[PDB]
Write a protein that binds this ligand. Sequence first.
Ligand SMILES: CC(C)=C[C@H]1[C@H](C(=O)Nc2ccc(-c3ncccn3)c(Br)n2)C1(C)C
Ligand SMILES: CC(C)=C[C@H]1[C@H](C(=O)Nc2ccc(-c3ncccn3)c(Br)n2)C1(C)C
Lengths: 472, 472
Amino acid sequence: SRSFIAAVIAIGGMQLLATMDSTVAIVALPKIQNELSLSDAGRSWVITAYVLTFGGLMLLGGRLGDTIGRKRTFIVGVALFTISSVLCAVAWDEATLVIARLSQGVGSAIASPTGLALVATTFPKGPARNAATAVFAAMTAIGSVMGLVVGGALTEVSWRWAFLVNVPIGLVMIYLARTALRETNKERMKLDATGAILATLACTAAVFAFSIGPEKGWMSGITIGSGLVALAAAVAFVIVERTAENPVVPFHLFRDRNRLVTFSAILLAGGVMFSLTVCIGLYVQDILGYSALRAGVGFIPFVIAMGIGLGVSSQLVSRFSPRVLTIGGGYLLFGAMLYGSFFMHRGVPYFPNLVMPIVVGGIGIGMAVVPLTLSAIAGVGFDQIGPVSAIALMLQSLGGPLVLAVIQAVITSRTLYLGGTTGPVKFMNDVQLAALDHAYTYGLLWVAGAAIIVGGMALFIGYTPQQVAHAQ
Amino acid sequence: SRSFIAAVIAIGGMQLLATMDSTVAIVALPKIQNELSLSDAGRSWVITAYVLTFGGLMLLGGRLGDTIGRKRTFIVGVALFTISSVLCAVAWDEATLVIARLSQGVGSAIASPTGLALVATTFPKGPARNAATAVFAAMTAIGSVMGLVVGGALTEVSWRWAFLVNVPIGLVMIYLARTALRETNKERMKLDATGAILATLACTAAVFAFSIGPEKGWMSGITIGSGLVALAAAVAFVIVERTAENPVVPFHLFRDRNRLVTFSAILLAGGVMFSLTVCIGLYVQDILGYSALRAGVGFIPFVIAMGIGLGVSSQLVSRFSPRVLTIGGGYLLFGAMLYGSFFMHRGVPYFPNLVMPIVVGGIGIGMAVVPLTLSAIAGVGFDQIGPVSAIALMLQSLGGPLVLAVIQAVITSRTLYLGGTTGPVKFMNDVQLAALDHAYTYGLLWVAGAAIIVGGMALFIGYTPQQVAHAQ
Ligand SMILES: CC(C)=C[C@H]1[C@H](C(=O)Nc2ccc(-c3ncccn3)c(Br)n2)C1(C)C
Ligand SMILES: CC(C)=C[C@H]1[C@H](C(=O)Nc2ccc(-c3ncccn3)c(Br)n2)C1(C)C
């Protein structure tokens, strides 16, 4: 009872912390610019510092779990995250802020992968694993909405006070991490230093190239050089992993078609969800003119609906195949994305027009999330959960930017076609506002079209409700 | 008053009669084969003579209404259909049945397209036209189900009495149409005999080739010759229509993207509806073992649901665009088809596994069909409505076989994949029955894919509610 609650909260705390930090950091960018006197490059670098280390230290963090221990790695990561958040709060110049953000991203990349391995190992297959997966999914949304609310609330005094909010809750997690999580005293495995180094180099180079491409121009020497470095590092990693004991990423796993389909669905679904949340935030905080507080408190129905959906999916996964639940959730998600696409324009009441799509989509996402997570880590084995979980988190965090960039490009092209301007929102006339509203409602259609493929690829799962939701 | 009801029922009764006769002809084939000792070729000729005469002379029937008179043409078509129905029952040799069916199909082709023209040119734009369209679409399914019931319950004594049920219906049509509909009083036009003859012979050649394809083969010289003749006839028709005084198929109004998209949507939607009806009837009769009478009794809720959907759509079209209603109906129908594809197999109870999908699909079809046809008959002209209606009915009745053949091919391939057998379903064991059940449940997914492409392509309609459902 109490032990299970403590264990699931300790496992899910890292996702809550990371999402809260990201949301609060993105909310209070321009007060930071005013106080620190930063340029556009500094504004980009503040967010880029997190992503560089988050992406460049994913597989390594997944592998160190067997090298040292999962519990020790979890507390180490949470402690580093808290210390680097304190450094972010105390940071006085641009260099200190960048260093602190890089350290916090290092802690996130060393702590997040181990959470999925912990949820796989601590609880065996059965109802306990289902409930743990539901809690793990719910913590992310709860953290996102809470971070949005607190960041909006703390916009009146200073941006420094916002980072310190990450200190107490994290400490609580540490306390829980010291009690519920146990150690099996299993034999300690080794690490493939060459493969891990190659993977880290390739990931860091790719992330740096992707971030610096649009900002400094494409094919600007640095961009192509970083791309070539990433390609060479990936090729060397693939060559090395062919005959290396305890691979960083086992390629022979990806032969099964069930797992390939599941992972591709994970990538696409993560991209769609990230694009949806970014677009809805921009539309609510830009077009309708809602403040940060109202935008934050308007997503509580989303949290409640997603929790209800996750609970229902956890209850019903023990008898129904994962593809059925995935398509069932997608049905309501696609209904909401169309209702919003057709009957949303500036000047509509919140209650009868905006909250119902939120509730329907949240319920659909609640049913959709659990079966994919259960299928990803199904029948994997202890000595191999690490890389699978690391790849799952990597794909979820990687699908986002590409789809978001495509949607923003479509919206910009539509706005240019309607007769608007690409300037700032705060210096816009009525015609440009109408053009932007129509462009956003048009981009929702492309998001739904992407969801079409996301769901159609999920018809080839093949898993049965006896390999993911029963004991042994 | 009573005049409105009389007009709408008289207009739709031709669709009712055609659908009922087609259903009762499909039902009573084995009895005719036993009685007349006809081979498979005889049955194929019997089923295909009506199709040949219905497709070959459709455009001529739609065009002669302007030169002769719409009311007079409808009267003549109904009388010819009644006489042919009387002749069909009292037959002694194969030739008599063939010629009676040919005459009946000729009459149906002459009379059916004039119904939509009468709807357009008799009831002014507004609520009256909406109600007329709703009832016109409703009694098609009403006639389908009542003809299925009559054929099931009447073929237990004598097959000849099945073809004698059309006489009272034809008599009430002739009386009501003579009493209610009134003369157009328009100046008589002139007919382009050469173009009409070319189009009629091209359509006849195409239908004959399609009929003789499966019976003979795809390599036989007869099929190649028929196809070449059809292509040459189409070339002659299109080249002569360059400077036709009263073109049979005007190409000058096909420069509107909305109209072309609407016509393609009509084609694909009609194909999907025909395929779904045929497949569900075959599934109910073959696998579940239901009798014809039980199937007829079990589809009355489909009629009721379609009526409810039409009633709601007629009122809703006054304020919303065709796109929104079409997509909502497609949403409900997609949900119903997915539920059928997943949770259906032999041995299930009838009540909570077969009524809800039927009702939801009926509501969706009702909400979907009305906006499409109002879009089809919107803004054409008093001198070109006939050809437009003829093209609409031609595409609606032509889309069926094209997709039904593909669906049946997929079903047979899937059946052979699991290792079933080909032939009669009554002589199979449990293995082949299970294989064929899985094949039908798999083909439902392809029908759903056809529906989703239908909706995606109908997303580009672009009409305005004012031009379709607003008066003056
Ligand atoms: C051909 C076919 C069966 C289409 C199905 C799509 C679907 O079911 N689409 C879907 C399903 C699930 C998710 C999702 N969302 C968040 C997290 C995980 N999964 C998403 Br974006 N789209 C629709 C309902 C249109
Ligand atoms: C991208 C997009 C907007 C997809 C929409 C499809 C749709 O809305 N599909 C649809 C819509 C209408 C009809 C129909 N059915 C009978 C008679 C007339 N129309 C049919 Br088959 N499918 C779905 C709900 C998946």
